[PDB]
Paper text:
In this study we demonstrate that AnSt-D7L1, a two-domain member of this group from Anopheles stephensi, retains the CysLT binding function seen in the homolog AeD7 from Aedes aegypti but has lost the ability to bind biogenic amines. Unlike any previously characterized members of the D7 family, AnSt-D7L1 has acquired the important function of binding thromboxane A2 (TXA2) and its analogs with high affinity. The crystal structure of AnSt-D7L1 contains two OBP-like domains and has a structure similar to AeD7.
The structure revealed two OBP domains with the N-terminal domain containing three disulfide bonds and the C-terminal domain containing two. In AnSt-D7L1 the C-terminal domain also contains seven α-helices and is less similar in overall structure to AeD7 than is the N-terminal domain. In AnSt-D7L1, the second α-helix of AeD7 (B2) is not present. Arg 177 in AnSt-D7L1 is equivalent to Arg 176 in AeD7 but is positioned such that its side chain partially occupies the same space as the ligand in the AeD7-norepinephrine complex. Along with other changes, including the presence of tryptophan rather than leucine at position 173 in AnSt-D7L1, this modification acts to further fill the space equivalent to the biogenic amine binding pocket of the AeD7 C-terminal domain. Most notably, a histidine residue (position 189 in AeD7) that forms hydrogen bonds with the phenolic hydroxyl groups of serotonin and norepinephine is mutated to alanine (Ala 190) in AnSt-D7L1. In the absence of ligands, the segment between Leu 291 and the C-terminus (Phe 297) extends away from the surface of the protein and forms a β-turn between Thr 293 and His 296.
Residue numbers in the entry: 2 to 297
Write the structure that this text describes.
């Protein structure tokens, strides 16, 4: 239960979710995107302050419960990958010192941005090495970590391979299905998928993430129904919730939402490319493109 370092998939998840939730859309996007993609924490405004708090929280450099910067995680993040990044121990120590000096104050977006900015300006490139913030550096981690979910591979596919590893044939051998067989392998696959989609963690179900997936297939008016189905669900395991959703009158919409998130979990950039949901047939087409030489 010491804090554990984040691998490439975990960092890439944070970066794409913080773009989704903070990057402006439309005509003002290009200025923010060009600065943030270059790891420049500019301009100094509320949009950027909340983005910075999102990235610091996701990388677990800021802990909201303690309301503190966790400078002791910097050397832990470095130790886990140091044979791949080859980052310099002396610089890692300096980054640790600098972050230990910062004051989170109230923990508000602007307090975190103001405390972190001088540290960022000094250690930005090292931080991109440590937290898999470059495409080439993260690619080395994925090469070294064939066991984590790869770019282009959906969590539903990754979890299926792990769940039916044995002598039992996969239930999804001619394609993933919504059949509720109650098998140990299915319960295992569903837990792994719900955790990869951030529907669940050790603290329990995150209803707002399932609702988010309904919003993303243009069904936001069903939010109350989603909440109601999950609130009356008995059992606490991922498979229990999946069962309630699949048996409910939301079945087809949930299938569409979970299928779109399959696509989105294989290509973490999907919504940032400007792509949106269209219909189930288009999701299938886009999934087929992932299994081609160029992957799109």
């Amino acid at each position: 239960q010491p804090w554990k370092a984040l691998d490439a998939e975990q960092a890439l998840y944070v970066y794409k979710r913080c773009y989704e939730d903070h990057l402006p859309s439309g005509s003002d996007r290009k200025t923010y995107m060009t600065l943030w993609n270059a790891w420049r924490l500019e301009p100094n405004d509320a949009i950027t302050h909340c983005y910075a708090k999102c990235v610091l929280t996701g990388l677990q450099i800021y802990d909201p419960q303690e309301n503190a910067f966790k400078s002791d995680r910097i050397p832990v993040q470095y130790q886990a990958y140091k044979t791949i990044t080859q980052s310099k121990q002396k610089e890692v120590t300096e980054y640790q010192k600098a972050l230990a000096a910062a004051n989170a104050k109230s923990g508000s977006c602007v307090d975190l941005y103001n405390a972190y900015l001088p540290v960022h300006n000094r250690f930005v490139n090292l931080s991109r090495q440590l937290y898999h913030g470059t495409v080439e550096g993260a690619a080395k981690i994925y090469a070294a970590m064939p066991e984590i979910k790869q770019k282009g591979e959906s969590f539903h596919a990754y979890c299926e391979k792990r769940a039916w590893k044995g002598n039992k044939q996969s239930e999804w051998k001619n394609g993933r299905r919504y059949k509720l067989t109650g098998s140990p392998e299915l319960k295992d696959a569903i837990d792994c998928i719900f955790r990869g989609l951030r529907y669940m963690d050790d603290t329990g179900l995150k209803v707002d993430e399932i609702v988010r997936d309904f919003n993303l297939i243009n069904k936001s008016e069903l939010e109350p129904e989603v909440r109601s189905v999950l609130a009356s669900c008995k059992g606490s395991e991922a498979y229990d919730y999946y069962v309630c959703l699949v048996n409910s009158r939301l079945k087809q919409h949930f299938k569409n939402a979970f299928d779109f998130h399959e696509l989105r979990s294989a290509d973490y950039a999907y919504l940032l490319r400007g792509k949106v949901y269209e219909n189930p047939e288009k999701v299938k087409e886009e999934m087929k493109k992932l299994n081609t030489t160029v992957h799109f």
